[PDB]
Amino acid sequence: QTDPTLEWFLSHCHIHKYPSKSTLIHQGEKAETLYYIVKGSVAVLIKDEEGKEMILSYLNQGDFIGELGLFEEGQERSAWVRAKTACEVAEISYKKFRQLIQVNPDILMRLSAQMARRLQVTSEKVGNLAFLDVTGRIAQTLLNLAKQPDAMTHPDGMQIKITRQEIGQIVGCSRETVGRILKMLEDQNLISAHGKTIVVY
Amino acid sequence: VLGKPQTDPTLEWFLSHCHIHKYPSKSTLIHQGEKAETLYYIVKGSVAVLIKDEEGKEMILSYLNQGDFIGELGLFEEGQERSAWVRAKTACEVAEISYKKFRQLIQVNPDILMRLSAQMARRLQVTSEKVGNLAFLDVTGRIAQTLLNLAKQPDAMTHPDGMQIKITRQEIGQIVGCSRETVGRILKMLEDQNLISAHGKTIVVYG
Ligand SMILES: Nc1ncnc2c1ncn2[C@@H]1O[C@@H]2COP(=O)(O)O[C@H]2[C@H]1O
Ligand SMILES: Nc1ncnc2c1ncn2[C@@H]1O[C@@H]2COP(=O)(O)O[C@H]2[C@H]1O
Numbered sequence: 491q492t493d494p495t496l497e498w499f500l501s502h503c504h505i506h507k508y509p510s511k512s513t514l515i516h517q518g519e520k521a522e523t524l525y526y527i528v529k530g531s532v533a534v535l536i537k538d539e540e541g542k543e544m545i546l547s548y549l550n551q552g553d554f555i556g557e558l559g560l561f562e563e564g565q566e567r568s569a570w571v572r573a574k575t576a577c578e579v580a581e582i583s584y585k586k587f588r589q590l591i592q593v594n595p596d597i598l599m600r601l602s603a604q605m606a607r608r609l610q611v612t613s614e615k616v617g618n619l620a621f622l623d624v625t626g627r628i629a630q631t632l633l634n635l636a637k638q639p640d641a642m643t644h645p646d647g648m649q650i651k652i653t654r655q656e657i658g659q660i661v662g663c664s665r666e667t668v669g670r671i672l673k674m675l676e677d678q679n680l681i682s683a684h685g686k687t688i689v690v691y
Numbered sequence: 692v693l694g695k696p697q698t699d700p701t702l703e704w705f706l707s708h709c710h711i712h713k714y715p716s717k718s719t720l721i722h723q724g725e726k727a728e729t730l731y732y733i734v735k736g737s738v739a740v741l742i743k744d745e746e747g748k749e750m751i752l753s754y755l756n757q758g759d760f761i762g763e764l765g766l767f768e769e770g771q772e773r774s775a776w777v778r779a780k781t782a783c784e785v786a787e788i789s790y791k792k793f794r795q796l797i798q799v800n801p802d803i804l805m806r807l808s809a810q811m812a813r814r815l816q817v818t819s820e821k822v823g824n825l826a827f828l829d830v831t832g833r834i835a836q837t838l839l840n841l842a843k844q845p846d847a848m849t850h851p852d853g854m855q856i857k858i859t860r861q862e863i864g865q866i867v868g869c870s871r872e873t874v875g876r877i878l879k880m881l882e883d884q885n886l887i888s889a890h891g892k893t894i895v896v897y898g
């Protein structure tokens with residue numbers, strides 16, 4: 491939930507609300523502010539020259555955002571961050587945050603812990619993209635999804651609400667191809683798809 | 692008069708609490724899967740951080756050099772395992788310290804944590820870029836883009852037909868995550884398409 495250290499930090503921040511689908515951070519912007527999700531979830535994405543989008547990660551309540559430019563001035567935001575649901579996010583200037591670190595470094599410890607987890611997760615993603623064919627990547631994804639907090643249940647494993655587009659942004663493939671692969675998987679008796687709902691055996 | 696610190700005082704302080712050892716090229720410093728309880732710091736040399744598929748095909752997540760911390764990912768939560776193998780690329784001199792001791796140092800001077808965090812931030816930026824490239828390019832494009840980027844490094848040699856780089860098929864394979872044989876077939880194709888010239892471990896990237 492929360493504690494006095496986190497609340498001490500938050501009392502130094504201004505809270506802003508972001509409707510679902512609104513962009514909090516744009517790639518290329520000058521990085522001078524740190525964010526903290528008090529409520530809601532977001533998606534972190536990068537793009538290709540022709541507009542193809544790839545989702546690097548989903549982040550939720552309790553997660554810091556916009557932290558990558560904190561340790562060196564003059565850096566640009568490394569990706570776009572968009573609200574997945576309605577969000578309430580705390581924000582504070584890098585300058586003010588660095589001053590807080592000196593008062594109580596524990597706040598930096600908490601931020602660093604999340605960066606470490608993100609590097610582990612992103613590195614696993616590199617491996618999947620390099621060693622698994624699109625079919626195996628989709629297979630693996632239909633699992634990592636049952637890990638998210640928004641994940642639900644079902645007698646035969648668990649149910650999730652994911653679209654072809656969302657899957658494609660995660661594995662690096664068109665909606666069309668994702669559709670063909672999903673059909674093969676349920677043909678291989680691995681899953682059961684019903685609209686935007688899927689059953690993971 | 693007593694002299695000034697040969698190098699950064701905070702770094703020397705940190706290193707005085709570590710134990711340092713020498714590792715010959717090709718030696719494995721960190722094995723993927725081991726329980727993580729210690730932090731490393733490269734005093735001299737360079738290493739390769741790598742992962743492998745079920746059959747042993749290798750991919751380098753990153754090269755790390757003098758001044759870089761290693762084995763830091765298990766520091767913020769106990770019970771974790773090493774996320775990848777770390778193998779010496781050249782002869783290395785590496786410092787090691789327990790997470791327990793490092794945490795005590797952090798309490799004394801938070802600056803040492805700031806320094807480590809700065810590196811984790813940079814690694815996340817670089818690794819995220821790699822994810823994009825792997826998602827947006829097929830095997831041919833990954834190799835073509837890797838050659839182009841190598842041609843843009845300061846160590847790349849100017850050539851009358853473009854830029855000249857020196858790298859083996861094995862190293863290229865390790866960067867893109869494919870076999871030496873695959874690199875061979877694709878380099879031959881790129882050459883037939885008059886995009887590059889290959890002669891041994893010397894490649895000319897046409898401009
Ligand atoms: N290699 C890729 N090929 C096709 N689409 C990709 C790739 N990498 C990422 N994508 C994105 O994945 C998205 C999912 O569905 P769309 O076809 O609507 O649009 C897609 C692209 O923007
Ligand atoms: N691989 C990743 N995993 C999780 N979050 C990321 C990743 N890459 C970028 N981000 C977030 O995207 C944010 C947008 O701008 P910053 O680079 O300032 O800080 C970034 C990180 O918080």
Ligand SMILES: Nc1ncnc2c1ncn2[C@@H]1O[C@@H]2COP(=O)(O)O[C@H]2[C@H]1O
Nearest residue numbers: 752753761762763764765773774814818
């Ligand atoms: N993507 C990456 N970029 C740079 N270094 C990495 C990456 N992934 C893992 N490492 C290093 O590999 C080390 C081996 O074990 P740890 O997980 O303890 O700490 C790790 C990091 O120091």
